[PDB]
Specification:
This is Stomoxyn. Its main location: secreted. Keywords: Amidation, Antibiotic, Antimicrobial, Fungicide, Immunity, Innate immunity, Secreted, Signal. It is found in: Secreted. The chain is an all-alpha fold. The chain has one domain (1-42): Single alpha-helices involved in coiled-coils or other helix-helix interfaces, CATH 6.10.250. Helix content is 69%, strand content 0%. It has 3 helices and no strands. It is rod-shaped, with a radius of gyration of 17 Å.
Length: 42
């Protein structure tokens, strides 16, 4: 019954850290390779 409640709070930031870092493999074709690259293309 540890005070992991305040730890989970940090984890909330961690989950985003994990995402923001490796989520580029997905987000890459969300706007970059699906908008920004197009507008710059034609």
């Amino acid at each position: 019954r540890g005070f992991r409640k305040h730890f989970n709070k940090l984890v909330k930031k961690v989950k985003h850290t994990i995402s923001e870092t490796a989520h580029v493999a997905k987000d890459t074709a969300v706007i970059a390779g699906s908008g920004a690259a197009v507008v710059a293309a034609t």
